[PDB]
Amino acid sequence: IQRTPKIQVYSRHPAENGKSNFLNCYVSGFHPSDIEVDLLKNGERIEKVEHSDLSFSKDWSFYLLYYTEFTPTEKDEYACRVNHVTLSQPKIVKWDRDM
Amino acid sequence: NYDYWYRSF
Amino acid sequence: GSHSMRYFSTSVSRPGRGEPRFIAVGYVDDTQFVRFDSDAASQRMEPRAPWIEQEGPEYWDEETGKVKAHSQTDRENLRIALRYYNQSEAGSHTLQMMFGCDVGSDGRFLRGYHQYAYDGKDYIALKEDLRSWTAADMAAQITKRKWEAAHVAEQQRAYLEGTCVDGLRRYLENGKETLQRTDPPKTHMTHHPISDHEATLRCWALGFYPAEITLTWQRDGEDQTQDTELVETRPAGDGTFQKWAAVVVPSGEEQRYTCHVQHEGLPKPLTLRW
Numbered sequence A: 001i002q003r004t005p006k007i008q009v010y011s012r013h014p015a016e017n018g019k020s021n022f023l024n025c026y027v028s029g030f031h032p033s034d035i036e037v038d039l040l041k042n043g044e045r046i047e048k049v050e051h052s053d054l055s056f057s058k059d060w061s062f063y064l065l066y067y068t069e070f071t072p073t074e075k076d077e078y079a080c081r082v083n084h085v086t087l088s089q090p091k092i093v094k095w096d097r098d099m
Numbered sequence B: 001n002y003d004y005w006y007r008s009f
Numbered sequence C: 001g002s003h004s005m006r007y008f009s010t011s012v013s014r015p016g017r018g019e020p021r022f023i024a025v026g027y028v029d030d031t032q033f034v035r036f037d038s039d040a041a042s043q044r045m046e047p048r049a050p051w052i053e054q055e056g057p058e059y060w061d062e063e064t065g066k067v068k069a070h071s072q073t074d075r076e077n078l079r080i081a082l083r084y085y086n087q088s089e090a091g092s093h094t095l096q097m098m099f100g101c102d103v104g105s106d107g108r109f110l111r112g113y114h115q116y117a118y119d120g121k122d123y124i125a126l127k128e129d130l131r132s133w134t135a136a137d138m139a140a141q142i143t144k145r146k147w148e149a150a151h152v153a154e155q156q157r158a159y160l161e162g163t164c165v166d167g168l169r170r171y172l173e174n175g176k177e178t179l180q181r182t183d184p185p186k187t188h189m190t191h192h193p194i195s196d197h198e199a200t201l202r203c204w205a206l207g208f209y210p211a212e213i214t215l216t217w218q219r220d221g222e223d224q225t226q227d228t229e230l231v232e233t234r235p236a237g238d239g240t241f242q243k244w245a246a247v248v249v250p251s252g253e254e255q256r257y258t259c260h261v262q263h264e265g266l267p268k269p270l271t272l273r274w
Helices: C057-084 C138-149 C157-174
Strands: A006-011 A021-030 A036-041 A062-070 A078-083 A091-094 C003-012 C021-028 C031-037 C094-103 C109-118 C121-126 C133-135 C186-193 C198-208 C214-219 C222-224 C228-230 C241-250 C257-262 C270-272
Touching: A006 A078, A006 A091, A021 A036, A021 A078, A036 A062, C003 C057, C003 C157, C021 C057, C021 C157, C031 C057, C057 C094, C057 C138, C094 C157, C109 C157, C121 C138, C133 C138, C186 C270, C198 C214, C198 C257, C214 C241, C241 C257
Parallel strands: none
Antiparallel strands: A006 A021, A021 A062, A036 A078, A078 A091, C003 C021, C003 C094, C021 C031, C094 C109, C109 C121, C121 C133, C186 C198, C198 C241, C214 C222, C214 C257, C228 C241, C257 C270
């Protein structure tokens, strides 16, 4: 009756330092739909993050896309912090340029 | 187009 | 060659925080085109694809009226379910609904759908014959008997085989450029030593539409699933999708593993080999 989110953190296009891009955090497969999803830049929460409209899969589990325009650099670290009732502590998933 | 839906459980 | 229309709705009760929240969205195939959010200020069905913006104001008023009525109906159904399950009014609960239709490449009706879940689990669903229901438990069976006595199934067929089909067809024409196009997957593969004994190979598919795709690893020509990992297909955010599949291999043996990519926009399946 309660399902933990699957959590993927990725860029819209292959990462290239200095070139603008989109940073994505995709959460799926979860229930209930109460959830907090934030993007972190070197541990600080990014202020203008958008998200898609609440939808769900054939098994009734929810999925959402959170995303922000950004420009990766050699020194900046990105992560997605997911807060959900099935997680005793928020999951913090760092960005891997090849997942 | 949406459906007009009024049925109760 | 077939296509689909689906509407998805979620009602979440908020005891002590006001009326239940209602969010609905609409898709043609894997492309969203409308939404409604009961907590939004506009209180309107709003466009989410360019080809729908060309609908005139009678469309948006009618569609707004229909989705608002649904939000009230499921407001009520949340209350009744609480009764059927003998649950306290202090807890929060979810009611999800899905409805729509498929048409053939023909253009003609293939399938209609109408289904509920309560707290993430099946409640009642209209069977494919559109004459009968499948209920998941004793609570849903009360609703099932109620809906048979009132011939709800028959009364839904006008929408499912008429309105639903008519709208889907019109959308497919107003948006041929988007919805009837196929985007083939751009593929590549990556390679990471993780020991002096082992390395990971990762097979990528990028920029493809529709979302349906298959990625499989073969070792020496035989399908392999041991030591593999396949992620859920995911939105790039521009309307296309992404997926990858990875396998851990003994160092030095990369060349006997092949990744195979099948997608509607691929005349021929792709084979990748490092």
